[PDB]
RNA sequence: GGGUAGUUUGACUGGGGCGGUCGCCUCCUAAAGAGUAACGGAGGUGCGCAAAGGUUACCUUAGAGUGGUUGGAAAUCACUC
């Protein structure tokens, strides 16, 4: 059995058809779809505190399911007293089935558990179908336990879509039921 | 141990002395082969690396614009040019 995420089932069985009708696309897979979700977290303070970076990496692992990579400093800078090549950030890429499952978990479970959650700004679009927005308190995810955290942390989420514009991606996200603050 | 004896204490230098300089590398002066002076005009150097070597395999920045918890012009990530 090729086990399939419920999001993938929902997409393939409805969303393709509604978007074809709604945007008069000539051929079927002109329809937008999702290629990757990038979860990033920038801990510049890790240059003092290694525990911060280790905790962030581990907590990302529990949140998603796959291990993270610690990015390095592209340039040595003094304003943040950064030496080139130091560990400064940590990111995870989600693709395919894991991507769909994570996005489902997020939208239905973790966005609800945010303090004063009143939707998400439906305008954080880079003009090319890529939607990036932040979450300040990782504790919204029930996966991580409260006691073991060493410092409350946030993280940025970027969703990359095959769409050529923002309208297409916003329509796809709305069909997915993404709680945009509107 | 200058009581006494034998000797040394450089050269370039727009006189000499003082000052500065003396090996080697990069560019201009140098007039489109090469070479070509000056106390002409600007820099570096008497090392480091057991990888920062060899080989195979796999990859590409910086900047401008746009969207994102710290994160601001600028830290990390996505996309366009």
mmCIF file of C-alpha atoms (C1' of nucleotides) in Angstrom:
data_model
loop_
_atom_site.group_PDB
_atom_site.id
_atom_site.type_symbol
_atom_site.label_atom_id
_atom_site.label_comp_id
_atom_site.label_asym_id
_atom_site.label_seq_id
_atom_site.Cartn_x
_atom_site.Cartn_y
_atom_site.Cartn_z
ATOM 1 C CA UNK A 1 0.000 0.000 0.000
ATOM 2 C CA UNK A 2 1.134 3.494 -0.939
ATOM 3 C CA UNK A 3 -0.179 5.220 2.162
ATOM 4 C CA UNK A 4 -1.211 8.746 1.248
ATOM 5 C CA UNK A 5 -1.667 11.837 3.436
ATOM 6 C CA UNK A 6 -5.260 12.987 3.736
ATOM 7 C CA UNK A 7 -4.147 16.370 2.425
ATOM 8 C CA UNK A 8 -2.816 14.698 -0.701
ATOM 9 C CA UNK A 9 -6.101 12.836 -1.119
ATOM 10 C CA UNK A 10 -8.111 16.037 -0.671
ATOM 11 C CA UNK A 11 -5.906 17.938 -3.103
ATOM 12 C CA UNK A 12 -5.941 15.288 -5.815
ATOM 13 C CA UNK A 13 -9.638 14.559 -5.609
ATOM 14 C CA UNK A 14 -11.103 18.092 -5.338
ATOM 15 C CA UNK A 15 -8.689 20.992 -5.480
ATOM 16 C CA UNK A 16 -7.413 20.228 -8.971
ATOM 17 C CA UNK A 17 -10.960 20.346 -10.315
ATOM 18 C CA UNK A 18 -12.055 23.486 -8.469
ATOM 19 C CA UNK A 19 -8.919 25.355 -9.529
ATOM 20 C CA UNK A 20 -9.246 24.225 -13.156
ATOM 21 C CA UNK A 21 -12.802 25.539 -13.223
ATOM 22 C CA UNK A 22 -11.969 28.690 -11.261
ATOM 23 C CA UNK A 23 -8.947 29.701 -13.360
ATOM 24 C CA UNK A 24 -9.972 28.257 -16.764
ATOM 25 C CA UNK A 25 -6.609 26.512 -17.111
ATOM 26 C CA UNK A 26 -6.280 24.727 -20.434
ATOM 27 C CA UNK A 27 -4.274 21.707 -19.260
ATOM 28 C CA UNK A 28 -4.672 19.877 -15.994
ATOM 29 C CA UNK A 29 -1.324 20.299 -14.227
ATOM 30 C CA UNK A 30 -1.169 23.944 -15.042
ATOM 31 C CA UNK A 31 -2.854 23.709 -11.607
ATOM 32 C CA UNK A 32 -0.628 24.970 -8.770
ATOM 33 C CA UNK A 33 0.880 22.578 -6.251
ATOM 34 C CA UNK A 34 3.373 22.664 -3.396
ATOM 35 C CA UNK A 35 7.068 21.876 -3.903
ATOM 36 C CA UNK A 36 8.733 22.540 -0.554
ATOM 37 C CA UNK A 37 8.224 23.954 2.923
ATOM 38 C CA UNK A 38 11.276 25.529 4.544
ATOM 39 C CA UNK A 39 11.257 25.961 8.319
ATOM 40 C CA UNK A 40 14.024 28.301 9.425
ATOM 41 C CA UNK A 41 15.176 29.668 12.761
ATOM 42 C CA UNK A 42 17.916 32.232 13.196
ATOM 43 C CA UNK A 43 19.701 32.129 16.532
ATOM 44 C CA UNK A 44 22.419 34.743 16.317
ATOM 45 C CA UNK A 45 22.912 34.382 20.068
ATOM 46 C CA UNK A 46 24.174 30.858 19.498
ATOM 47 C CA UNK A 47 27.565 32.499 18.959
ATOM 48 C CA UNK A 48 27.615 32.774 22.732
ATOM 49 C CA UNK A 49 25.231 29.990 23.742
ATOM 50 C CA UNK A 50 25.723 26.608 22.105
ATOM 51 C CA UNK A 51 22.867 25.241 24.209
ATOM 52 C CA UNK A 52 20.460 27.591 22.417
ATOM 53 C CA UNK A 53 21.413 26.200 19.022
ATOM 54 C CA UNK A 54 21.339 22.587 20.186
ATOM 55 C CA UNK A 55 17.910 23.082 21.753
ATOM 56 C CA UNK A 56 16.585 24.730 18.592
ATOM 57 C CA UNK A 57 17.852 21.882 16.415
ATOM 58 C CA UNK A 58 16.347 19.255 18.716
ATOM 59 C CA UNK A 59 13.024 21.019 19.035
ATOM 60 C CA UNK A 60 12.821 21.297 15.252
ATOM 61 C CA UNK A 61 13.440 17.561 15.108
ATOM 62 C CA UNK A 62 10.535 16.844 17.452
ATOM 63 C CA UNK A 63 8.269 19.323 15.654
ATOM 64 C CA UNK A 64 8.796 17.991 12.142
ATOM 65 C CA UNK A 65 10.175 14.473 12.258
ATOM 66 C CA UNK A 66 13.442 14.899 10.380
ATOM 67 C CA UNK A 67 16.756 16.293 11.554
ATOM 68 C CA UNK A 68 17.792 19.897 10.922
ATOM 69 C CA UNK A 69 20.870 21.504 9.385
ATOM 70 C CA UNK A 70 22.769 24.348 11.022
ATOM 71 C CA UNK A 71 23.568 27.005 8.433
ATOM 72 C CA UNK A 72 26.717 29.093 8.638
ATOM 73 C CA UNK A 73 27.607 32.765 8.389
ATOM 74 C CA UNK A 74 27.804 33.879 4.774
ATOM 75 C CA UNK A 75 29.788 36.971 5.786
ATOM 76 C CA UNK A 76 31.814 37.977 8.808
ATOM 77 C CA UNK A 77 30.139 41.055 10.292
ATOM 78 C CA UNK A 78 30.851 43.194 13.338
ATOM 79 C CA UNK A 79 27.486 44.767 14.147
ATOM 80 C CA UNK A 80 26.348 41.367 15.373
ATOM 81 C CA UNK A 81 30.031 40.482 15.938
ATOM 82 C CA UNK A 82 29.777 37.575 13.512
ATOM 83 C CA UNK A 83 32.780 35.598 12.313
ATOM 84 C CA UNK A 84 32.353 33.980 8.901
ATOM 85 C CA UNK A 85 31.505 30.300 9.051
ATOM 86 C CA UNK A 86 29.986 30.251 12.529
ATOM 87 C CA UNK A 87 26.800 28.295 13.204
ATOM 88 C CA UNK A 88 24.029 30.893 13.158
ATOM 89 C CA UNK A 89 20.827 29.303 11.880
ATOM 90 C CA UNK A 90 18.987 26.020 11.582
ATOM 91 C CA UNK A 91 16.543 24.877 8.924
ATOM 92 C CA UNK A 92 14.476 21.898 7.817
ATOM 93 C CA UNK A 93 13.054 21.119 4.380
ATOM 94 C CA UNK A 94 9.784 19.225 3.990
ATOM 95 C CA UNK A 95 8.805 17.706 0.647
ATOM 96 C CA UNK A 96 6.256 15.233 -0.632
ATOM 97 C CA UNK A 97 4.286 13.172 1.848
ATOM 98 C CA UNK A 98 6.084 14.573 4.886
ATOM 99 C CA UNK A 99 5.420 18.074 3.573
ATOM 100 C CA UNK A 100 1.685 17.444 3.182
ATOM 101 C CA UNK A 101 1.384 15.767 6.570
ATOM 102 C CA UNK A 102 3.235 18.570 8.339
ATOM 103 C CA UNK A 103 1.147 21.245 6.710
ATOM 104 C CA UNK A 104 -2.009 19.398 7.766
ATOM 105 C CA UNK A 105 -0.764 19.082 11.346
ATOM 106 C CA UNK A 106 0.094 22.774 11.391
ATOM 107 C CA UNK A 107 -3.087 24.191 9.947
ATOM 108 C CA UNK A 108 -5.431 22.026 11.977
ATOM 109 C CA UNK A 109 -3.607 21.828 15.284
ATOM 110 C CA UNK A 110 -0.798 24.291 15.953
ATOM 111 C CA UNK A 111 -2.218 27.508 14.532
ATOM 112 C CA UNK A 112 -5.260 26.993 16.815
ATOM 113 C CA UNK A 113 -3.024 26.847 19.897
ATOM 114 C CA UNK A 114 -1.457 30.298 19.397
ATOM 115 C CA UNK A 115 -2.077 33.089 21.888
ATOM 116 C CA UNK A 116 -4.545 35.583 20.417
ATOM 117 C CA UNK A 117 -4.575 33.688 17.133
ATOM 118 C CA UNK A 118 -6.701 35.839 14.813
ATOM 119 C CA UNK A 119 -5.604 34.434 11.494
ATOM 120 C CA UNK A 120 -2.503 35.125 9.432
ATOM 121 C CA UNK A 121 -1.851 38.219 7.314
ATOM 122 C CA UNK A 122 -3.098 37.271 3.866
ATOM 123 C CA UNK A 123 -0.541 39.560 2.256
ATOM 124 C CA UNK A 124 2.865 38.097 3.200
ATOM 125 C CA UNK A 125 3.425 37.048 -0.406
ATOM 126 C CA UNK A 126 6.702 37.689 -2.199
ATOM 127 C CA UNK A 127 4.832 38.372 -5.434
ATOM 128 C CA UNK A 128 5.702 34.947 -6.840
ATOM 129 C CA UNK A 129 3.518 32.502 -4.941
ATOM 130 C CA UNK A 130 5.850 31.993 -1.972
ATOM 131 C CA UNK A 131 4.234 32.610 1.411
ATOM 132 C CA UNK A 132 6.478 33.284 4.401
ATOM 133 C CA UNK A 133 5.288 34.052 7.908
ATOM 134 C CA UNK A 134 6.414 33.655 11.492
ATOM 135 C CA UNK A 135 5.414 31.828 14.665
ATOM 136 C CA UNK A 136 6.749 33.306 17.885
ATOM 137 C CA UNK A 137 6.041 30.509 20.398
ATOM 138 C CA UNK A 138 6.998 27.001 19.293
ATOM 139 C CA UNK A 139 5.128 25.705 22.339
ATOM 140 C CA UNK A 140 1.970 25.915 20.226
ATOM 141 C CA UNK A 141 3.005 22.537 18.823
ATOM 142 C CA UNK A 142 1.830 19.906 21.292
ATOM 143 C CA UNK A 143 4.672 17.641 20.116
ATOM 144 C CA UNK A 144 7.260 19.398 22.284
ATOM 145 C CA UNK A 145 6.946 19.290 26.064
ATOM 146 C CA UNK A 146 6.970 22.509 28.046
ATOM 147 C CA UNK A 147 9.411 21.511 30.784
ATOM 148 C CA UNK A 148 12.460 20.750 28.637
ATOM 149 C CA UNK A 149 12.547 24.060 26.750
ATOM 150 C CA UNK A 150 15.501 26.273 27.610
ATOM 151 C CA UNK A 151 14.183 29.493 26.050
ATOM 152 C CA UNK A 152 10.913 30.331 24.274
ATOM 153 C CA UNK A 153 11.678 30.623 20.574
ATOM 154 C CA UNK A 154 10.063 31.442 17.257
ATOM 155 C CA UNK A 155 10.606 30.378 13.690
ATOM 156 C CA UNK A 156 9.758 31.317 10.115
ATOM 157 C CA UNK A 157 7.824 29.182 7.634
ATOM 158 C CA UNK A 158 8.125 29.526 3.866
ATOM 159 C CA UNK A 159 5.730 27.694 1.550
ATOM 160 C CA UNK A 160 6.901 27.406 -2.058
ATOM 161 C CA UNK A 161 4.240 26.974 -4.725
ATOM 162 C CA UNK A 162 4.340 26.344 -8.455
ATOM 163 C CA UNK A 163 2.099 29.385 -8.929
ATOM 164 C CA UNK A 164 3.254 32.261 -11.109
ATOM 165 C CA UNK A 165 1.526 34.873 -8.928
ATOM 166 C CA UNK A 166 0.047 35.513 -5.507
ATOM 167 C CA UNK A 167 -3.591 35.106 -6.536
ATOM 168 C CA UNK A 168 -3.137 31.448 -7.452
ATOM 169 C CA UNK A 169 -1.339 30.552 -4.228
ATOM 170 C CA UNK A 170 -3.827 32.424 -2.063
ATOM 171 C CA UNK A 171 -6.653 30.562 -3.788
ATOM 172 C CA UNK A 172 -4.902 27.234 -3.215
ATOM 173 C CA UNK A 173 -4.262 28.034 0.440
ATOM 174 C CA UNK A 174 -7.868 29.124 0.952
ATOM 175 C CA UNK A 175 -9.065 25.874 -0.619
ATOM 176 C CA UNK A 176 -6.751 24.145 1.866
ATOM 177 C CA UNK A 177 -8.529 26.205 4.511
ATOM 178 C CA UNK A 178 -5.529 28.175 5.719
ATOM 179 C CA UNK A 179 -6.747 30.630 8.382
ATOM 180 C CA UNK A 180 -5.906 33.939 6.763
ATOM 181 C CA UNK A 181 -6.796 36.944 8.884
ATOM 182 C CA UNK A 182 -9.423 38.472 6.614
ATOM 183 C "C1'" G B 1 95.233 46.331 31.872
ATOM 184 C "C1'" G B 2 94.662 52.992 26.051
ATOM 185 C "C1'" G B 3 100.378 51.960 30.490
ATOM 186 C "C1'" U B 4 101.823 50.520 25.337
ATOM 187 C "C1'" A B 5 101.629 48.634 20.111
ATOM 188 C "C1'" G B 6 99.384 47.053 15.541
ATOM 189 C "C1'" U B 7 94.387 48.133 12.819
ATOM 190 C "C1'" U B 8 89.176 48.884 11.665
ATOM 191 C "C1'" U B 9 85.121 52.243 11.623
ATOM 192 C "C1'" G B 10 81.279 51.202 3.958
ATOM 193 C "C1'" A B 11 78.836 52.962 -0.375
ATOM 194 C "C1'" C B 12 74.945 55.438 -3.092
ATOM 195 C "C1'" U B 13 74.098 60.809 -2.314
ATOM 196 C "C1'" G B 14 72.030 66.687 -7.744
ATOM 197 C "C1'" G B 15 79.219 68.886 -3.081
ATOM 198 C "C1'" G B 16 79.889 66.627 1.545
ATOM 199 C "C1'" G B 17 77.667 65.654 6.223
ATOM 200 C "C1'" C B 18 72.941 64.721 8.728
ATOM 201 C "C1'" G B 19 68.724 61.894 7.264
ATOM 202 C "C1'" G B 20 67.125 57.887 4.265
ATOM 203 C "C1'" U B 21 68.213 53.422 1.553
ATOM 204 C "C1'" C B 22 70.744 48.463 0.183
ATOM 205 C "C1'" G B 23 67.517 41.056 -0.871
ATOM 206 C "C1'" C B 24 63.159 39.736 -3.437
ATOM 207 C "C1'" C B 25 57.897 40.228 -5.370
ATOM 208 C "C1'" U B 26 53.230 43.328 -7.918
ATOM 209 C "C1'" C B 27 51.619 47.810 -10.975
ATOM 210 C "C1'" C B 28 52.648 52.454 -13.458
ATOM 211 C "C1'" U B 29 56.464 55.530 -15.309
ATOM 212 C "C1'" A B 30 58.042 52.139 -20.061
ATOM 213 C "C1'" A B 31 56.810 55.604 -26.025
ATOM 214 C "C1'" A B 32 51.267 48.653 -28.101
ATOM 215 C "C1'" G B 33 58.021 42.119 -28.982
ATOM 216 C "C1'" A B 34 61.508 42.004 -25.146
ATOM 217 C "C1'" G B 35 64.511 45.319 -22.625
ATOM 218 C "C1'" U B 36 64.826 50.452 -20.650
ATOM 219 C "C1'" A B 37 67.050 55.242 -15.470
ATOM 220 C "C1'" A B 38 65.935 58.284 -11.097
ATOM 221 C "C1'" C B 39 66.606 60.107 -3.735
ATOM 222 C "C1'" G B 40 59.936 58.743 -9.753
ATOM 223 C "C1'" G B 41 54.701 57.497 -7.983
ATOM 224 C "C1'" A B 42 51.981 53.403 -4.967
ATOM 225 C "C1'" G B 43 52.036 48.161 -1.849
ATOM 226 C "C1'" G B 44 53.710 43.629 0.185
ATOM 227 C "C1'" U B 45 57.536 40.398 2.066
ATOM 228 C "C1'" G B 46 62.581 36.832 5.188
ATOM 229 C "C1'" C B 47 55.643 32.885 5.787
ATOM 230 C "C1'" G B 48 51.528 29.787 6.557
ATOM 231 C "C1'" C B 49 49.296 25.044 5.498
ATOM 232 C "C1'" A B 50 49.697 17.053 7.217
ATOM 233 C "C1'" A B 51 45.482 20.367 4.500
ATOM 234 C "C1'" A B 52 44.889 25.413 2.806
ATOM 235 C "C1'" G B 53 48.404 18.775 -0.688
ATOM 236 C "C1'" G B 54 47.164 14.794 -4.500
ATOM 237 C "C1'" U B 55 42.936 12.130 -6.812
ATOM 238 C "C1'" U B 56 37.732 11.138 -7.696
ATOM 239 C "C1'" A B 57 32.747 12.759 -7.363
ATOM 240 C "C1'" C B 58 29.225 16.640 -6.616
ATOM 241 C "C1'" C B 59 27.804 22.039 -6.461
ATOM 242 C "C1'" U B 60 27.955 28.208 -7.206
ATOM 243 C "C1'" U B 61 28.213 33.664 -5.392
ATOM 244 C "C1'" A B 62 28.003 39.351 -4.459
ATOM 245 C "C1'" G B 63 24.381 43.106 -5.256
ATOM 246 C "C1'" A B 64 19.233 45.257 -6.359
ATOM 247 C "C1'" G B 65 13.937 44.303 -5.511
ATOM 248 C "C1'" U B 66 9.936 41.479 -2.728
ATOM 249 C "C1'" G B 67 7.895 38.475 1.645
ATOM 250 C "C1'" G B 68 9.099 36.647 6.834
ATOM 251 C "C1'" U B 69 9.552 35.866 15.762
ATOM 252 C "C1'" U B 70 13.724 38.291 17.554
ATOM 253 C "C1'" G B 71 15.894 40.643 12.701
ATOM 254 C "C1'" G B 72 16.593 47.183 12.462
ATOM 255 C "C1'" A B 73 19.629 49.355 6.069
ATOM 256 C "C1'" A B 74 22.204 44.924 7.153
ATOM 257 C "C1'" A B 75 22.422 38.089 10.634
ATOM 258 C "C1'" U B 76 18.992 33.160 8.468
ATOM 259 C "C1'" C B 77 15.438 31.423 4.614
ATOM 260 C "C1'" A B 78 12.211 31.697 -0.211
ATOM 261 C "C1'" C B 79 11.628 33.935 -5.130
ATOM 262 C "C1'" U B 80 12.476 37.690 -9.378
ATOM 263 C "C1'" C B 81 16.189 40.535 -11.988
#
